Amino acid sequence: HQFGDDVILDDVQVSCYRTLCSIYSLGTTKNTYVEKLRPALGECLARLAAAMPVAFLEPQLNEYNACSVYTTKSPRERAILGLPNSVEEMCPDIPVLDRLMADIGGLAESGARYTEMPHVIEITLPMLCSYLPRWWERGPEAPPPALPAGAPPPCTAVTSDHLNSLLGNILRIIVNNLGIDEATWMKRLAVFAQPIVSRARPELLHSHFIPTIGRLRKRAGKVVAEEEQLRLEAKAEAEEGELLVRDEFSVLCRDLYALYPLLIRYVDNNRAHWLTEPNANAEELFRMVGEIFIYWSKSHNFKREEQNFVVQNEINNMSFLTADSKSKMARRGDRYSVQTSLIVATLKKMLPIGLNMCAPTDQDLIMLAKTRYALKDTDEEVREFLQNNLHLQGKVEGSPSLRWQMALYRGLPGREEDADDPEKIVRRVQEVSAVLYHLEQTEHPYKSKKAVWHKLLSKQRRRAVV
């Protein structure tokens, strides 16, 4: 409710400043009570940093900060009450924002694991995930309606560059820890890094997100290869190894829920740019996230591990989708629902990128190739069947609907007639044909008329079985 500027003003300010200062002073401490209280302490200062009205990591610009003691109060006062007479001395043990970001900066690129950075992950990162968004809107690059009130200089030095550097840095810290057994903190940086992804730059997509998700794609492909390896050779030992893939599918579902919430809010902020002007990498990432989904749609273990992870860790799976509506000042499956499941939420939010590759002339091939997939054909059976049926693609003259769809498609800046090579068309229909095939298996499960409410013998014989 933005009460920081009018509640924490004069003597509450020193009070929480003492609270903020002691909680972080836990850095040089390594105790067991510290270990379990880090999630409690990390969330405590994260909500504190969003509320503190003073740029407590940027002491050099406090002379421009009216909502602080050093401007509201005279130097004659602030001496009867114990103060070090300088705003820079109030908490000397918190490194400045330029320093603090640089501290994490070398830490992530060094490949360190979570054991050597428990404070950085549990406490230092959450405050930065909350400190930086607070001082974006009151610093440079803000949209100032300051025609009458433009006289006061900005009292902080936070720009989009700082936010983007941290986000990729947090992305780098997760991939360093991508494969370890236990990490209950990934869901916590998942919920802390959302406010800072709103100002990522489009250069972030290629450098970080494509390599990280690609590793997850080849991770899932390797594991599902082991799974189908088990099922092709049935044995009583397959159970000893079914738990192996279950453990491997659990760590993947942990990693998917560690990165996908960052992609979802990233994608929402970049679809408009990707569709108005076509992007090569965006089409690649769809092919990446798409292949992971078809694994989950095909593998049965991936389905249960995704559901097991949500219920055990109490993933909201609803705030990850409603964040934009609430940020913009806006029952049935509240616990869990496949409609709001992140893996299919990622694809449904990323379908337009894949469908944008195909020209409307391929609409016949999409329905054509979907039929083969509904007949349980592999990705190579469709390719040859698409190759020999290239003359079935639609004709513009024979369809009034295609006349305008073509014209809109040809008007796109990145469209070239040379892109309609026989190998290029058959690829782009084959990749999507797998996607829309499995998606309609989920929105319409068509599992009805198989086990309907049947009341075989219960309604009159429930007493006997009890």
Binding site: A272, L321, S325, M329, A330, G333, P352, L408
Partner: protein
């Protein structure tokens, strides 16, 4: 009988933003003058003669819409009873042309100058063409609104407005006492030329839909300060009341120092000499007491306004710093005025509201005092003429002066705070002014019913030019025009003002929009879902629901729809040009949705809700009103009885009811020069016709009006009385006065039922029903009434060829309300003899099935024209004035309903 067709020209009206009116205690001047010079007229651009009229019109009622209307369409000035025009040969009012005599009579031609004079005192409207007087005046018309200059024209004209001053030098001297119209421009507006009540205008990317326009009232110029009759001030506040005057004298003298004033025995603004500008004590006490009356009102106002003020601090008054004028910024004498030093004082945001209301009331008190002294508003200050640019109510004042008055009152509030007095801000009481009627608030635009979609996935966009109350979505073909979108089951709309979705009520959805935000409305009739997107981002409810509405039955289908509130502008893009859509590619193209008009040669025809009341048959299934047709017995004639279906019960609708019979009686084209049995020779030659209305016992006669209405009655007034009836007198004379013709015009010739009840002690609900009878003589134009067999004093005279509908206006107070009695009297024919040609000689009363009771519906559906007249308005110069031009012709084929005299 058969419907008539003809080609007619479109007519448009153009007005300046100059509004004048008369009210008790109003600040506006009474006499106004303007001229219109004709530069180019093509007499016959089409097969119909070119329209061009000049005159005055009233804000509340003059709403000529393009296309159809009264008579044969092409309605302009004088085509209703709210406008008064002059085309060079006739005086136009109430859609009737009355020839008028002027030296060298001719239709308006190039190089003609028309001078229009308005005198609200009489009231009277007079014209002069090329300087010679026009021997005819409108007079004794209604004054319940503001008057503006207006010109109505068809294509092929070129005129210039001459408003005086820098907006057109007058070709002729205005008559004495009359003020140029340019003086009436309000402080917060620049002068310009605008259409009148437009629902559509051109824009950058296409046409813009426009909601109703906020309009001022003649009462908005009447200052209404808070009551200060309760002159009871606390004695401690009384003593400081004089002191507050001394201080405030210093600040507004201090501001005169900033403006450059010095001392002087003479007090002049230009000379910058001021006797008061020495000190608060040095300033003469009689000069001090000049503002004591107002200064006393300032303290009295907080008590009147509800603020609680008392002696919180007394030692603060005793000890306070005094700010003195700098010795450098020096006045002539050499003393330093010492207003109270008040830097330490701070005001709460609630207090900053009080000073605004304090400055409001202070200005209003001054304004109403000047009005009692004879002052009036004028854009150009004229001290000898008692004309003041600030002689306007507070809300109409410009911000430059509004802030100045606020600052002076702030110091006065600071002075009370400086002494330490407690000032309690009163709990603000909200109020709803309701400047416009209930119906002229929301204008609904929908596609034609032939575009109804029952399958497929469709998409369209709605850009919010403004940010106010507008709703957009999908509606069913049977959507009612007088119901808010989504208040019933006939529409699924999204209200972007506060983020709501409407269908059988409201529930939160999405976020409020901003200026330029584009709403993408998608309907999926395959999945029975409705999706709204804002700037390409799908709006969601207070849950993960990506769809606004679900499980919608297709039924008869759906149509794109939008509603615009007052002052709201929106752009509707149905996607005929797929490249024009701004967010279709981002969201909607890949999902399989199509633009609503993707393959259509012509733009989609749209229908809008026209708030012009019309008479329609009472529906057979109307929830509250029932009309039953009684047959004629031996002792009673055929009757049409009205009953209140739900009277007394919960949810009963009790409001003014306007009824008329579906068929008129037409007066003859030429008037004549200068027991109980009907005499066969008299009854077969009479031209008098009779009908009576029985007010059943229990229905209060005070709430019943009985009479006739002309086919141009569109007054759906919920507080109706005979003073609201439109009236105007057209008077003709010779070269020197000598009135030789004075006709009275109206659209409602009725008698009040309360004139026929004796002033008894009580028992106004009489045992006997009131039976008011109406007599019309079609050969003389004379109409008389009977109370209970006794002739009434009231009578009316009408011109030949007049159509009158038997009408009754009633506010129900009983289950049985009224009863049209279509009977006869001795030697007087019934109404069926006059309504039907085949029964001209049939004295037996009849009620044929065509005769039925009609009720006044406030809102109806109207078809938007496909093309509109291109009117170019510009300021031609300081002397030439403002130019109006229209060259390209436009014609529409009208369908004329004869008995209703509308097309």
């Amino acid at each position: 009988l058969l419907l008539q067709t003809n080609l007619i020209n479109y007519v448009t009206s153009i007005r300046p933003n100059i509004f004048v009116g008369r009210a008790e205690g109003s600040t506006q001047y009474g006499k106004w003058y303007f001229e219109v010079m004709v530069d180019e007229v093509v007499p016959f651009l089409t097969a119909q003669a070119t329209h061009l009229r000049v005159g005055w019109a009233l804000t509340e009622g003059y709403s000529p819409y393009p296309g159809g209307g009264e008579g044969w369409g092409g309605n302009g000035v004088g085509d209703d009873l709210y406008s008064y025009g002059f085309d060079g040969l006739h005086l136009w009012t109430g859609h009737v042309a009355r020839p008028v005599t002027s030296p060298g009579q001719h239709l308006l031609a190039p190089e003609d100058v028309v001078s229009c004079c308005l005198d609200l005192s009489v009231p009277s409207i007079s014209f002069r063409i090329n300087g010679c007087p026009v021997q005819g005046v409108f007079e004794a018309f209604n004054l319940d609104g503001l008057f503006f200059p207006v010109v109505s024209f068809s294509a092929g004209v070129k005129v210039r407005f001459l408003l005086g001053g820098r907006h057109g030098e007058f070709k002729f001297l205005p008559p004495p006492g009359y003020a140029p119209c340019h003086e009436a421009v309000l402080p917060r507006e620049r002068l310009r030329l605008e259409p009148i009540k437009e629902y559509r205008r051109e824009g950058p990317r296409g046409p813009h839909l426009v909601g109703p326009s906020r309009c001022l009232s003649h009462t908005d110029f009447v200052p209404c300060p808070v009551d200060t009759v309760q002159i009871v001030l606390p004695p401690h506040l009384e003593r400081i009341r004089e002191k507050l005057a001394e201080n405030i004298h210093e600040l507004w003298a201090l501001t005169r120092i900033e403006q450059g004033w010095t001392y002087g025995p003479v007090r002049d603004d230009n000379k910058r000499l001021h006797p008061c500008l020495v000190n608060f004590h040095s300033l003469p006490e009689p000069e001090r007491n000049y503002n004591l009356q107002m200064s006393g009102e300032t303290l009295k106002t907080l008590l009147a306004l509800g603020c609680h003020v008392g002696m919180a601090d007394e030692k603060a008054e005793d000890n306070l710093k005094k700010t003195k004028l700098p010795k450098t910024y020096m006045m002539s004498n050499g003393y330093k005025p010492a207003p109270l030093d008040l830097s330490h004082v701070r005001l709460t945001p609630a207090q900053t509201t009080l000073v605004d209301r304090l400055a409001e009331n202070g200005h209003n008190v001054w304004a109403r005092d000047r009005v009692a002294q004879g002052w009036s508003y004028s854009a150009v200050q004229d001290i000898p003429a008692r004309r003041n640019p600030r002689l306007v109510p507070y809300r109409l004042l410009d911000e430059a002066t509004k802030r100045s008055n606020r600052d002076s009152l702030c110091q006065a509030v600071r002075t009370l705070l400086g002494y330490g007095y407690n000032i309690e801000p009163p709990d603000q009481e909200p109020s709803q002014v309701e400047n416009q009627s209930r119906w002229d608030r929301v204008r609904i635009f929908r596609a034609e019913k032939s575009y109804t979609v029952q399958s497929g996935r469709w998409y369209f966009e709605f850009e919010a030019v403004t940010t106010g109350e507008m709703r957009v979505g999908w509606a069913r073909p049977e959507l009612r025009p007088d119901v808010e979108l989504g208040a019933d089951e006939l529409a699924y709309v999204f209200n972007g003002h506060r983020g709501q979705r409407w269908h059988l009520g409201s529930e939160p959805f999405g976020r409020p929009w901003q200026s330029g935000d584009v709403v993408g409305c998608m309907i999926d009739l395959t999945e029975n879902t409705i999706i709204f997107t804002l700037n390409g981002e799908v709006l969601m409810s207070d849950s993960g629901s990506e769809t606004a509405f679900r499980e919608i039955e297709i039924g008869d289908g759906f149509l794109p729809v939008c509603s615009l509130g007052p002052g709201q502008v929106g752009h509707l893009n149905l996607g005929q040009d797929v490249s024009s859509l701004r967010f279709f590619a981002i969201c909607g193209l890949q999902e399989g949705f199509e633009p609503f008009a993707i393959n259509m040669q012509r733009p989609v025809t749209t229908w809008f809700s026209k708030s012009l009341p019309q008479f329609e048959p009472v529906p057979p299934e109307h929830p509250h009103y029932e009309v039953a047709r009684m047959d004629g017995t031996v002792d009673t004639p055929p009757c049409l009885r009205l009953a209140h279906r739900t009277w007394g019960s919960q949810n009963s609708l009790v409001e003014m009811l306007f009824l008329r019979l579906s068929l008129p009686v037409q007066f003859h084209q030429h008037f004549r020069c200068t027991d109980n049995r009907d005499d066969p020779e008299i009854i077969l030659n009479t031209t008098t016709y009779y009908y009576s209305v029985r007010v059943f016992a229990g229905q209060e006669p005070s709430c019943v009006w009985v009479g006739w209405v002309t086919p141009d009655y569109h007054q759906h007034d919920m507080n109706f009385d005979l003073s609201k009836v439109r009236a105007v007198t057209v008077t003709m004379g010779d070269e020197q006065g000598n009135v030789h013709s004075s006709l009275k015009c109206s659209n409602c010739y009725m008698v009040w039922g309360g004139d026929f009840v004796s002033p008894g002690q009580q028992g106004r609900i009489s045992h006997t029903d009131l039976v008011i009878g109406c007599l019309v003589d079609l050969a003389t134009g004379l109409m008389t009434f009977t109370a209970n067999g006794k002739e009434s004093n009231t009578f009316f005279q009408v011109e030949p060829n007049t159509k009158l509908f038997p009408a009754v206006f009633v506010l129900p107070t009983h289950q049985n309300v009224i009863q049209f009695e279509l009977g006869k009297q001795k030697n007087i024919m019934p109404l069926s003899a006059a309504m039907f040609l085949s029964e001209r000689k049939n004295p037996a009363p009849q009620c044929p099935p065509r005769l039925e009771v009609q009720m006044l519906m406030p809102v109806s559906w109207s078809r938007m024209p496909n093309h509109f007249l291109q009117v170019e308005t510009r300021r031609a110069g300081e002397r030439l004035g403002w130019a109006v031009q229209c060259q390209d012709p436009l014609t529409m084929m009208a369908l004329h309903i004869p008995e209703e005299n509308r097309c």
